[model samples]
Target chain A: DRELAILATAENLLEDRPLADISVDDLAKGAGISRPTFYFYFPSKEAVLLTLLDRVVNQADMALQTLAEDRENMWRTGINVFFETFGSHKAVTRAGQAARATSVEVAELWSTFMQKWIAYTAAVIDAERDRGAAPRTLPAHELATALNLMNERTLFASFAGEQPSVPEARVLDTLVHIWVTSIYGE
Target chain B: DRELAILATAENLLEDRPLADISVDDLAKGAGISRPTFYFYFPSKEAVLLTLLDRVVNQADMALQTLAEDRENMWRTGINVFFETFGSHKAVTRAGQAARATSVEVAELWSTFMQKWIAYTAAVIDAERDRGAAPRTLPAHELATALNLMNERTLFASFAGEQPSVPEARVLDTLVHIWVTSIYGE
Candidate 1:
């Protein structure tokens, strides 16, 4: 119960400011625990954040898995799941990406997540080609890496408040167009 | 002359380690000056890095401008120039990207650069469509943003030594394929 409280408090604090700005004291106080009690639940602020991000990432993975199974609408549905999942947890997601620049643990976590996503996406693309639904344009893993990284960058820009980001309204359609055309042909 | 020496020293140091590991004292000593003298030449270490990055960025801009004017093989030439230019200055480019997560100045500089590249790319795509050389697919700017961000993220991954980064040999060809197919259709 206390561990869950710490995670919940960290997520709420992150919603208002970056992870760097929120200290363990802030997290503990927010969770209505003493500082020592907070340490008992989580080793560090980053640990709490990792748990929060893992929860969200797992939810997105499940959503994407279900969407990827739909051949006719896989690209649209899969990409949409990313936008919705990341958008809903915008602050935590942004914080995790920002930490990647400095934290080895955060960087490794994201790298592992990306490797999983790329493998899964490549499998989907290969399955399509095997079934004669898609052309063998670029190799499957290459194309998947390109598209997945594209999504990762685009979402980071949006979440980080970079101006002139892909406008929210058109981003999904534009990404889907690139994925479909690049793989399935026009 | 002193400013140039500092820049050169910083660049050499970055090749061996990240910018964060290279101190102003190191910069000054490498340039054969005192730390205070180094401050006189550049306000901060990041200033030195920004200047180094700006020089590389301008070179890339000139190369890209020339390539963008080539309607026959613009995609191939344009994307190749990016890989070549950034690949040559791998460490500084990586440092600048890593700094974007923490430095407001670095972040803004990169954002400004991306906006310029996306606009230039969109213009090129628009020119092709206007001349009936390419199909009207996704909006030029939207597609441009996606492709540009794709390049940005892909290059960062390669520079940052991420495992399973888009394989070096296939990266350019894969990017060109997506750009051509997404803009001109398959």
Candidate 2:
């Protein structure tokens, strides 16, 4: 429970400020714990972020698995669930991404999640190809990696509110258009 | 000259370590200057990155401008130049990307560069659509933005050596394939 409190504080602070500006002092005080206590739970601010990321990744794991047998349903639900999961923890998602810029552990953590998703996605693409449903212009793994990373970057901007004028639904449509076409190649 | 030294120092250090590990003091000492001297030119470590990004962006600016008059040749040249610009500064490119994870100024700086590219690419897509050279299935701007961000993330992974087993040329081919197919629908 105390660990959750510390994690909550860090994530909440990130909503208003960049992770670099949030010190251990701020995190501890926000959680009503001592600095040493904070350290006892997390080796550093990055560790706190790593913990939160694990939780976020689990949420995403569930979302990715939220697919039905329908290909159209899979694409739409997968994109929606991915964005919904990211939206619920907007601050934490942004924090994790920013930390990857300068944090190796953070980068590795993110890369691992992406690789897992790619492997899963590649299997689906390969299955489609084998069934003579998907295009064979590129390898399944290559297309999967490209498309998955496209979502990874596109949603980062969306969740960050970087371009406030861009409608989220429109962006979703744009991604879906690319995915549907890439796989079905209309 | 001293400013260049500091900038070069930051870029070199980032080759082997994350920017989080490089303190202002380390940057100063690396450049053979004192802390006070470091502040004389840039206000913060983030500023140093902002400065480095400007240098890197300028390099990219030149590369994008290097193109032939033919449309088919243009896509090939543009894609090649983009990768070459990124490849030449692999360490700095990786550091800039990682820093964007945590720094608003840095993130915004990077976004502005991407927006510029999207606008340029969109213009091409628009011209094609207007001439009926490309499909009108979606807005030119939307397709360009998605394709551009796709390359942004794809190359970040490629240049960072995230999945070293994936050859750079292959990844480049994958990205170009998507862009060409998305726009021209081959």
Which candidate leads in DockQ?
Answer: 1
* Candidate 1 Cα outliers beyond 4 Å, as residue runs: A68-72, B68-72
Badly placed stretches (over 4 Å) of model 2 are A2-10, A19-45, A68-70, A102-104, A163-166, B1-52, B66-73, B99-108, B163-166
Clashing pairs in 1: none
Q: What is the lDDT, from 0 to 100, of the residue A48 in candidate 2?
A: 87
Candidate 2 lDDT over residue span B21-105, tens digit each = 8899989998999999999999998889888887888788776866523554567678777788888888788878766656788
Candidate 1 C-alpha lDDT tens digits along B1-186: 999889989989999998878999999999999999998988999899888888888889998877655442667888888899999899889888877766788778888888999999899888889999988878899889988999998877876667658877778887887888888874
Best by TM-score: 1
- At residue B161, candidate 2 shows an lDDT of 65
In candidate 1, what are the lDDT values of residues A84-178, reduced to their tens digit? Answer: 99988988898887777667887888888889999998998898899998887788998899889999988777666676588877788888888
- Candidate 2 lDDT tens digits, A43-102: 888888888988998888876776633676677777787878887898899888877656
In candidate 2, position B182 carries an lDDT of 73
Model 1 achieves a DockQ score of 0.71
Model 2 error, position B146 (Å): 2.0
| TM-scores of the models, in the order given | 0.95, 0.81
